[PDB]
Amino acid sequence: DGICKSSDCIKSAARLIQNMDATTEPCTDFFKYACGGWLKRNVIPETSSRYGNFDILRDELEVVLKDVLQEPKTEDIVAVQKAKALYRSCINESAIDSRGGEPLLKLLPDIYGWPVATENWEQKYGASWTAEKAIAQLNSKYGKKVLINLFVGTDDKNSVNHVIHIDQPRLGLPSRDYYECTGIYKEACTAYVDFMISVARLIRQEERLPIDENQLALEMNKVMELEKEIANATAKPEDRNDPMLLYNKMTLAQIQNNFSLEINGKPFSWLNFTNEIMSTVNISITNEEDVVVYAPEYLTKLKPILTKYSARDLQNLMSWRFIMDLVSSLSRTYKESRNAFRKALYVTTSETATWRRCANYVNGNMENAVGRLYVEAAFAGESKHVVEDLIAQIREVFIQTLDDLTWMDAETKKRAEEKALAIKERIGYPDDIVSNDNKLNNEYLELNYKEDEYFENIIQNLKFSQSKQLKKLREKVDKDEWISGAAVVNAFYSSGRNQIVFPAGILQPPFFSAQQSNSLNYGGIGMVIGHEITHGFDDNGRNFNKDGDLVDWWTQQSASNFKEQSQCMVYQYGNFSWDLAGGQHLNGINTLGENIADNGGLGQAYRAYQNYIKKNGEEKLLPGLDLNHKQLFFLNFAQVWCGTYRPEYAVNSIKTDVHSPKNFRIIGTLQNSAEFSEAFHCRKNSYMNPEKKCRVW
Amino acid sequence: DGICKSSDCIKSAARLIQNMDATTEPCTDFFKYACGGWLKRNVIPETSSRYGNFDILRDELEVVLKDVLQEPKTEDIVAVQKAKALYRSCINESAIDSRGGEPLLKLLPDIYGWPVATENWEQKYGASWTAEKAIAQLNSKYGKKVLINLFVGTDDKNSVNHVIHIDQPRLGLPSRDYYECTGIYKEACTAYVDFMISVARLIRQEERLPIDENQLALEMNKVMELEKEIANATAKPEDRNDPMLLYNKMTLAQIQNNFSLEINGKPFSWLNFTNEIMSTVNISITNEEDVVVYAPEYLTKLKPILTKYSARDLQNLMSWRFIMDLVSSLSRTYKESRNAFRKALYVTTSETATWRRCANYVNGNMENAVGRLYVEAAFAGESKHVVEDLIAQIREVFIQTLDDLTWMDAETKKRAEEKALAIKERIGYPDDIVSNDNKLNNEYLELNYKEDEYFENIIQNLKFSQSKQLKKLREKVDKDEWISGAAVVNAFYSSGRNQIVFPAGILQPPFFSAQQSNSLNYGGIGMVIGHEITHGFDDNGRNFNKDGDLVDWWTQQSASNFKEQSQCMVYQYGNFSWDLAGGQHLNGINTLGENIADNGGLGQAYRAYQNYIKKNGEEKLLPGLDLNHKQLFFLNFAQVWCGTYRPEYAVNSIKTDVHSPKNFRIIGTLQNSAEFSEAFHCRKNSYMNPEKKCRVW
Ligand SMILES: CC(C)C[C@H](NP(=O)(O)O[C@@H]1O[C@@H](C)[C@H](O)[C@@H](O)[C@H]1O)C(=O)N[C@@H](Cc1c[nH]c2ccccc12)C(=O)O
Ligand SMILES: CC(C)C[C@H](NP(=O)(O)O[C@@H]1O[C@@H](C)[C@H](O)[C@@H](O)[C@H]1O)C(=O)N[C@@H](Cc1c[nH]c2ccccc12)C(=O)O
Ligand SMILES: *[C@@H]1O[C@H](CO)[C@@H](O)[C@H](O)[C@H]1NC(C)=O
Ligand SMILES: *[C@@H]1O[C@H](CO)[C@@H](O)[C@H](O)[C@H]1NC(C)=O
Ligand SMILES: *[C@@H]1O[C@H](CO)[C@@H](O)[C@H](O)[C@H]1NC(C)=O
Ligand SMILES: *[C@@H]1O[C@H](CO)[C@@H](O)[C@H](O)[C@H]1NC(C)=O
Ligand SMILES: *[C@@H]1O[C@H](CO)[C@@H](O)[C@H](O)[C@H]1NC(C)=O
Ligand SMILES: *[C@@H]1O[C@H](CO)[C@@H](O)[C@H](O)[C@H]1NC(C)=O
Ligand SMILES: [Zn+2]
Ligand SMILES: [Zn+2]
């Protein structure tokens, strides 16, 4: 009868059936058609601002992590014993609750204290205090970047080396838009200072110091005034989206020349600051060091701001930025103060399960030890070969498509073919994490965890992570180093390494299974593969050559044509109105890169699917579904995107998110697909089938 | 090919496949075989002590309730407008948080205050205070039963009338076993007094009274000492399991004669107490009123206890018992004190979503308004006919089986056939809730909800619910009155009304669907129907005749044989060792009624299924499953029971739970089923197929 009746097909079919809304016309709204069933069943948990298929797979991944982390085993190597020990220190709330805020109080003097919670700060600290030393201590010891973000990273123009970088810092609130403190941000800004005041009060109460509410509010509203200024000086994301423009290499004496700063009446020294950081790792810095400035405008605007604030005003903000990230690792009363602030930002009334947060904390700090446990428990490493072949098919489809693009000249097509061939793929997990105990053990050698000392553990992890990073400066970028752990539900592209990464976490249904129909595999992981590859050729990635160097490989015409073809997508998405954000329009510019990758990716995936049919023929149909495989490809593509958002998340996320909302990632992509309209027999100018169709890749 | 390939079959098959563990031998452990897949995926949420298929359907039911309750609609009748208004008052935490504890402080004088949180209680209250008035006010106004449980209910020996009843009261902690306060109960007992002290402190703090921690601990440990005594005086559940023995009718002067009480040096008056309660509803009580005493031993043991405590000692416990149930309806700080106590009893680190608790609160107080919304949104009332026919088939199978039972004499089989024919069934929802707006509106007429006054709302609901109940005394039991709302995931048997109830909430997959295979329907809802019917013939129900009267219809021999046949199940279950409770054995006596119902129910369901095959033939097989329908019947029966428990829940629940743990409800029942062993080709004496098989029905 030409219908698949296997256990696998039945499982696939029930999933597709349950999620879709067959009472909707696919040519009217494919999001509702493909996801309407998912939406009616699912509700956003109280722990989340949004919920989708990512969150489902992530929640399930965490259950695997709990299972592998919770039980000590006889044959466990030291790296595995350390992850489990770290897990045990995290889940012991009784041990944590006992210490109160004592571990923060001990750490405080090492970061020049917190003026608001310190008595006679000027006499105790303000004597040996310098901006150079204060910022440097927070950076080198704890990896916390305030006022000035100094980091060691790959040189965009020489991908084999590391170089010192200077950029604008992250802010306490989610984005620079919050600092307006009116309308949708009023509550958050109020809750932000309220959180500062609450934390200040708890520390003083513990240290038995007099509490003046008037003074706490005065010192804390001044931190907010200082941060509001810093936030206004930061460049907007649209002013940072061009990598050629962002790159500004100069000497440390040149930085010292042009970017002068006066903190506490006395001028700031860029050479002392850098050595204060680099001495931590026994690295000498000359007055002739090359440094990439990502934010020259920000440093220029920073000078008139910093002259207006005292040592106390600055240290109050600097210490707060570190403290706010530590409160959750302390007792109940400290935790309760962050929960209230979280509730104000995200409209979430509950924190995630402690075991879940802990499994995630361990996975993030020990990605190789946890990744090994994950793959041994949940990933069939045999399926690395199936994906290896799919990546090969999609890479080939990208190269073949170059011929069919009219907007590029033969010379640009040649260089793009060069970049596409040089893409290195990373599938599942690095083989070494399973086969090489010595290398695994040695990565965590300097880490010694105590089961009753969670805070000591987290502070050690902050020190280790940052020491590793600073050490890399004089070193060459390691080729065999993975940009992601195995136990991650995501996929990535590195412009600097010209690499696509597919962690084991994403190589599972609905995206992939060597036992699921090929239409579902091409529709899911096949689109993800094209998405990641297309990232090497988007408004940001096209600026990097085959070796990951930031060099122009485009002719003046081909590049003007790229911008021309892209502009169609800018207006198409910028014309979408988001009902969860109150009908507010999408930012077509902020989301361009992702929209090019989505549109390029779905296109490349379907072609590869057609090519698979040419070579192998039609697959057996799925039972209980009155759809062919051409249609099932698009339905599975849309179902990987089933998701929803809180109206309060949407009103804010619309301005800064780089990915389009899920309904629009589905709508936008299929509106540009003639093959979608063919498979679904969409009448010309039906919502899903507009006459005009944007196309880049 | 004889295989069903419909959308419905595919959905059923994927559910069966996903939940089972096909790598387990069904004759070794059918729980693992049928549920192993369910267990690997699912984890107990932080809000729960246990999790199973009940919790899944309940969570999903709540999503329906949220959807129907949240949006006001134009065509809404007043009863519906009231449920939505009540819902809105419940979900407004800002309105709730604003009032602090003020609504409790206003209510307090009406219940003779709380001595520990009152200044000069003796001068302010102890002048007009009597046990008779204090207990009566808490009972009649708020429905709270302390020291003595006086209630109006159906007369076990005349099911058409209501009569006053006297029983032992409920305790503050989950059961009388907690009051040992050692071992597994130490933490709970400590957390219980800690909760009392915390609530006492918050009230004093609000009223601006001096806080002496030494005195709070002294007064509260005395409440615990008083409750420990009360708990010890209460009869054990094994001493209350025989309804003929529990029934003791006597006159109110006779109660006053034998059960004398001396509270605060002066003797207690059973006539003043009763009138103090019954005057609330304008009902006069004579000194010659007939009253059913369920706890004569408890009242006898109560006298030496109550003479040892003062007016203050008693009112401290009495008020606490009401206050502990109110704290969750107050602000953050009041809520936080209960959360800590909850965390100590249940090892739960988070409270359920506010919307969920609210939807449940509205459903419980307005079951007819919410039931109407539920069925209109989620239940196909056409499927009432399908279930009507299934109940008819199972009732017929029960009657036919009576012939085949060797342990009963023809005379008892005749009376059991009489009872079985007189069972009235209640399916889905009462038709009136949808078709009769006037009757619906009139049920809630005396209720007027204010959207900003949640507390006022809950206190009004306590008053209404209790006034209705007391009013029923001189009235006849209403025949057409349903024992459950429609929006409930459970099924019930009433001995007093001789009725089986199947709310719409249980008439959904995995139990039932007019579109799911008949083997799955008989295995699910068919077993539930037999379970409920068999309840009319268990160790408790067999004591009630066809009219719901507590009369002996058994011959001396047939009744001695019932106990003999039952004893097999007592030892079989009492020999099961529960791994989650540390290998502790099940209580074969506490769980007997449920085990008879489970064993009787599965048996009746399979026979009816066989009868269906005789009349209609073999159904088409399910795809992706290498099982026939005989086997699918048992797999679905076991899958309705997929569930798990927290070790901390199990160690306590094993001593008092009346239902066996889910694995044992599956294991115990199939060990007694020769048809299970036939369908699965189980070798004699394999774990699932013991040689000896217990049988009652
Ligand atoms: C094709 C998709 C599976 C992977 C794809 N990752 P990719 O855009 O290359 O990269 C993502 O966004 C970049 C801006 C960040 O730099 C990266 O760190 C990463 O977050 C993405 O859309 N990620 C989204 C959404 C997403 C992540 N994991 C998922 C799992 C299922 C469904 C959706 C997702 C995100 O990271 O926010
Ligand atoms: C056959 C079953 C669906 C219904 C069956 N109800 P039933 O035992 O007649 O009655 C239940 O227990 C009695 C002791 C109480 O008096 C009743 O109030 C009721 O709680 C039962 O086992 N209920 C269990 C478990 C349960 C309730 N709802 C479920 C839904 C799905 C799975 C299991 C359950 C319980 O109430 O605890
Ligand atoms: C929690 O921490 C305390 C403090 O050292 C310790 O006594 C206890 O064993 C810990 N609990 C677990 C489960 O490890
Ligand atoms: C940097 O400058 C300060 C000025 O206060 C001096 O104390 C310090 O020792 C210098 N440190 C390094 C590491 O260059
Ligand atoms: C919407 O579409 C038109 C092109 O049709 C474009 O010119 C316009 O700028 C777009 N609007 C937004 C808000 O991006
Ligand atoms: C919450 O309660 C306040 C107090 O009356 C009211 O102002 C507000 O409208 C309420 N919010 C909602 C969503 O009903
Ligand atoms: C009951 O007895 C008390 C004794 O204090 C008396 O005050 C009261 O009015 C009587 N009430 C009723 C309703 O019989
Ligand atoms: C277990 O089984 C035997 C019958 O074989 C019975 O006599 C005994 O009392 C049972 N044990 C318990 C603890 O119920
Ligand atoms: Zn992307
Ligand atoms: Zn039962």
Author numbering:
A (entry chain A), B (entry chain A): 53 to 749
Copy out sentences from the published article reporting this entry, exactly as the authors wrote them:
The overall structure of the double mutant NEP is similar to wild-type NEP, with two domains which are connected by three interdomain linker segments, together enclosing a large water filled cavity. The second mutated residue Val399 is at a distance of 20 Å from Lys714, located in the smaller domain (domain 2) at the surface of the protein at the interface between the two domains. The interdomain distance, as measured by Cα-Cα distance from residue Val399 in domain 2 to e. g. residue Arg698 in domain 1, increases by more than 2 Å (from 5.9 Å to 8.4 Å in wild-type NEP and NEPv, respectively). Furthermore Lys714 limits the conformational flexibility of Trp693 and thereby reduces the plasticity and size of the S1’ pocket. The overall binding mode of phosphoramidon in the NEP double mutant is similar to that observed in wild-type. The C-terminal extension of the phosphoramidon binds differently. While the phosphoramidon tryptophan pyrrole retains the interaction with Val541 O and the stacking interaction with Phe106, the positions of the phosphoramidon tryptophan and Phe106 side chain moieties are interchanged. Large ligand induced flexibility of amino acid side chains is observed in the substrate binding site, with particularly Trp693 functioning as a switch between the S1’ and S2’ pockets in wild-type NEP; (P1’ and P2’ dependency shown in Oefner et al.,, Glossop et al.,). In the crystal structure of the NEPv presented here, the two mutations have reduced the substrate binding sites S1’ and S2’ as well as decreased the binding site plasticity.
Neprilysin, or neutral endopeptidase (NEP), is an integral type II membrane-bound zinc-dependent peptidase of approximately 750 amino acid residues that degrades a number of physiological peptides that are involved in processes such as blood pressure regulation and nociception. NEP is composed of an ectodomain, which contains the catalytic site and belongs to the M13 family of peptidases/proteases, a transmembrane domain and a short intracellular domain. The structure of the ectodomain is composed of two largely α-helical domains (domains 1 and 2) that are arranged to form a central spherical water-filled core that contains the active site of the enzyme. The larger N-terminal domain (domain 1), which is structurally related to the bacterial protease thermolysin, contains a single zinc atom that is critical for peptidase activity and is coordinated by His and Glu residues.
